């Protein structure tokens, strides 16, 4: 069902009819529309019973690292830097006798992970409020709706 979600979102994007665009600084309307569609789709997923979303919310784009995070605002430079950045069966059968690249899949996945983090933050803002939004930003401490998210399907850790 994970690849099901991937294909569903990619089909929705193709309906939108779009790395190149991210570096395409002047394409602000496109970026706003795509992030709008993505936020609506994530709202649909995390809330299967609530599909309605803010159909007109303000947007903005940042371009400098001082305007970068280490009305929706986006860190265009960093995201551009990112986008630019079984045996037995097959042996048994060896004796029995519009394309998307894998790196593009990685890019789309990183985009989705960043956007779902941003949408989690946005949801925190909407329900808990602006202050507890800032608290979540300062402290990011899943499954409680959340099952509709592919993030809960994989875990990443750190070690010194």
């Amino acid at each position: 069902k994970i690849k099901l979600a991937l294909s569903k979102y990619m089909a929705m994007l193709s309906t939108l009819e779009m790395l190149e665009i991210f570096r395409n600084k002047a394409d602000t309307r496109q970026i706003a529309a795509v992030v709008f569609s993505t936020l609506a789709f994530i709202h649909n997923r995390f809330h299967p019973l609530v599909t309605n979303f803010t159909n007109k919310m303000e947007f903005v784009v940042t371009e400098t690292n001082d305007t970068s995070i280490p009305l929706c605002s986006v860190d265009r430079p960093s995201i551009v830097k990112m986008l630019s950045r079984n045996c037995n069966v097959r042996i048994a059968k060896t004796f029995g006798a519009f394309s998307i690249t894998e790196v593009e899949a990685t890019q789309y996945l990183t985009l989705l992970l960043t956007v779902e983090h941003a949408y989690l933050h946005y949801y925190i803002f909407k329900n808990y409020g602006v202050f507890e939004y800032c608290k979540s930003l300062t402290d990011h401490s899943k499954l409680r709706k959340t099952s509709n998210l592919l993030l809960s399907k994989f875990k990443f850790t750190i070690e010194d």
């Binding site: 690292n65 280490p70 402290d139 990011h140 401490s141 899943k142 993030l151 809960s152 850790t157 750190i158």
Partner: peptide, 17 residues
């Protein structure tokens, strides 16, 4: 770049299901 102390644990919370 920002000369900023990093929080491994906050990132883990971002990616701790």
């Amino acid at each position: 770049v920002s000369n900023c102390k990093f929080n491994i644990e906050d990132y883990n919370n971002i990616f701790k299901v």
